[PDB]
Amino acid sequence: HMRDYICEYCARAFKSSHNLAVHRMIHTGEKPLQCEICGFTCRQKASLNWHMKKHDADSFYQFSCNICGKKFEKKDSVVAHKAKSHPEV
Ligand SMILES: [Zn+2]
Ligand SMILES: [Zn+2]
Ligand SMILES: [Zn+2]
């Protein structure tokens, strides 16, 4: 326990105070940026932002709806569906 940064209970072990602070978005006071779709947390706005785009029409795998996972033939069907069936998520 020297380079083993523990968040009392809810960190197994991090190697940097900032790494633990990335999780610590709940109790820290600063609050970094987590993907509100799943879990994936980062310091820079672009890194999670494009990872969220990965879920949108499912650029992460094949084709899905980020919001209700209806599953479509093409991303066009997803984006067309999301703009109509999700005005207020
Ligand atoms: Zn914690
Ligand atoms: Zn995500
Ligand atoms: Zn949907």
Swiss-Prot record:
Subcellular location: Nucleus
Superkingdom, taxonomy of origin: Eukaryota
Tissue-by-tissue expression: Expressed ubiquitously, particularly at high level in testis. Isoform 2 is testis specific.
ZnF C2H2-type span: 5-27, 33-55, 63-86
Annotated TM spans: none
Disulfide bond residue pairs: none
Subunit structure: Interacts with MAP3K14/NIK.
Protein role: Atypical E3 ubiquitin-protein ligase that mediates 'Lys-63'-linked ubiquitination of MAP3K14/NIK, leading to stabilize and activate MAP3K14/NIK. It thereby acts as an activator of the non-canonical NF-kappa-B2/NFKB2 pathway. May also play an important role in cell proliferation and/or anti-apoptosis.
Family: Belongs to the krueppel C2H2-type zinc-finger protein family.
Other observations noted: In contrast to other E3 ubiquitin-protein ligase, does not contain any domain (RING-type zinc finger or HECT domain) known to mediate E3 ligase activity.
Name this protein carries in UniProt: E3 ubiquitin-protein ligase ZFP91
Species annotation: Homo sapiens
Interval of the full protein contained in this chain: 370 to 456 of 570
